[PDB]
Amino acid sequence: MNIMLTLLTNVTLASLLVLIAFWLPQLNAYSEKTSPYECGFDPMGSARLPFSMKFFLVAITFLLFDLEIALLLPLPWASQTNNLKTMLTMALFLLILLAASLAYEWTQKGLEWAE
């Protein structure tokens, strides 16, 4: 409830700022002013053409490692268990497998951007 009210307040303040920005000043618009910016000359192509991503593999590895950290996040509560040895073994197992993934990709050149 309080968090919903806080989010509503923040969104309303930002929207009011946008509304004041777009309605208070004097406006003069013409085709030359609203043209896209490319340092004084016209753009040759379109900004919607495909843009090669040289780190496409690091992105996939990021997805996998992000869910690894999702697995790792509940560790502070896992430390209150009576099975401390089993908990410690499995935590270190997950971290060692994450390290193994990083080592494999690093040695197999997955961290190098495409040329």
Ligand X SMILES: CCCCCCCCCCCCCCCCCC(=O)OC[C@H](COP(=O)([O-])OCC[N+](C)(C)C)OC(=O)CCCCCCCCCCCCCCCCC
Q: Count of residues binding ligand X (CB under 6 A)?
A: 4
> CA 6 → CA 1, 16, 20, distances in Å?
9, 15, 21
Shortest CB 57 distance to ligand X, Å? 30
- Contact (CB, 8 A) for 60 and 86: no
CB 113 within 8 A of CB 54: yes
User: Which of ligand X, ligand PEE, other proteins, none interacts with 34 (beta carbon under 5 to 8 A by kind)?
Assistant: none
Q: How far apart are CA 42 and CA 112, in angstroms?
A: 34
Footprint of ligand X (CB under 6 A): 20, 24-26
Q: Which residues bind other proteins (CB under 8 A)?
A: 1-3, 46, 48-53, 56-57, 59-64, 66-68, 70-71, 73-75, 77-78, 80-88, 90-94, 96-101, 104-105, 108, 110
